[PDB]
Design an enzyme around this catalytic site. Structure first.
Site: not given
Ligand SMILES: COc1cc([C@@H](Nc2ccc(C(=N)N)cc2)C(=O)N[C@H](C(=O)O)c2ccccc2)ccc1OCc1ccccc1
Ligand SMILES: [Ca+2]
Lengths: 55, 247
Positions: B41, B90, B179, B185
């Site tokens: 992504h 992904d 988190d 990413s």
């Protein structure tokens, strides 16, 4: 007993099952097996998954 | 990384920073001297395909301390079953133009055997995620992995939602405190097992960052080991983006 399903077969890294006989151990790229037939050892200066400064 | 500590320089040597024309794109993962594993992504927008840079040994984005090693990205390989606008599959494999030189500060992360991962690594309770998101340091975090059926049961239901699929897995915290996040990413989800670290996941997606009753969803790498090993032996290709078939 001596099977990969049981606690990774007691192997440090990779474990291999065979149909009639006891499980065998193996090692990752850049590691190789020791005399206990379970433990691995780097055959390179910077094997993967090891943090230099912490050792 | 919400609610994490700083990764002491050197303790995360596989971390990759990805740049496009100087702009911060994503985090990646080093697996050998020539290959990098990041999220698919990250490449949705990319127009100028020829300006990608992978940076290694990087720690603080505000000072070049020398250890940094920068290489051009020769290739981005993506599964044919990944389609933008959908969170599935992904994962991206990245070849570098010239290899990196392994140092005390640039070490690859082990890529485990499929079986070993699914049988052993899948059940190591905690694994570290990391990413950058005056002093812009690399941040690390310890998240607990949950199996899909729990993750769904513990997650707050929404009308419009993607399934957690056989190519994903949930790790993290429900209380809204810790988190991984968008800026992380493609970064490693690293799993320690008996003295060695292995890549098990890729920061994929989540519902905001650290939102209460929500976990971070990761790409399940164990699914792609054969797919990656095979492609790492593949001959160099013309063009940057390659869409290799999966499986
Ligand atoms: C890939 O995907 C994605 C991603 C995202 C993120 N990440 C993350 C988050 C969270 C987290 C946690 N919590 N851990 C992690 C990671 C991110 O990355 N974001 C970004 C922006 O926005 O810009 C993007 C998106 C998409 C594409 C590209 C890019 C977010 C979200 C998403 O997804 C969602 C969806 C999509 C499609 C369909 C459905 C859903
Ligand atoms: Ca720096």
């Amino acid at each position: 007993q001596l099977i990969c399903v049981n606690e990774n077969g007691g192997c440090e890294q990779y474990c291999s099952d065979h149909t009639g006989t006891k499980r065998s151990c193996r090692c990752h790229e850049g590691y190789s097996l020791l005399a206990d037939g379970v433990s691995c050892t780097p055959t390179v200066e910077y094997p993967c998954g090891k943090i230099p400064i912490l050792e | 990384i919400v609610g994490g500590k700083v990764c002491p320089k050197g303790e995360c040597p596989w971390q990759v920073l990805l740049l496009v024309n100087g702009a911060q794109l994503c985090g990646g993962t080093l697996i050998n001297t020539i290959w990098v594993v990041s999220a698919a992504h990250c490449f949705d927008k990319i127009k100028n395909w020829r300006n990608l840079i992978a940076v290694l040994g990087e720690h603080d984005l505000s000072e070049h301390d020398g250890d940094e090693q920068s290489r051009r990205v020769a290739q981005v390989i993506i599964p044919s079953t990944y389609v933008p606008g959908t969170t599935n599959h992904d994962i991206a494999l990245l070849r570098l133009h010239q290899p990196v030189v392994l140092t005390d500060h640039v070490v690859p992360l082990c890529l485990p055997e499929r079986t070993f991962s699914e049988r052993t690594l899948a059940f190591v309770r905690f694994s570290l995620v990391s990413g950058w998101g005056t002093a812009l340091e690399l941040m690390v975090l310890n998240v607990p992995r949950l199996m899909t059926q729990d993750c769904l049961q513990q997650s707050r239901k929404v009308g419009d939602s993607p399934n957690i699929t056989e190519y994903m897995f949930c790790a993290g915290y429900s209380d809204g405190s810790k988190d991984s996040c968008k800026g992380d990413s493609g970064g490693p989800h690293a799993t320690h097992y008996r003295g060695t670290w292995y890549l098990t996941g890729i920061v994929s997606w989540g519902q905001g960052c650290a939102t209460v009753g929500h976990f971070g969803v990761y790409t399940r790498v164990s699914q792609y080991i054969e797919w990656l090993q095979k492609l790492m032996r593949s001959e160099p290709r013309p063009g940057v983006l390659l869409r290799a078939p999966f499986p």
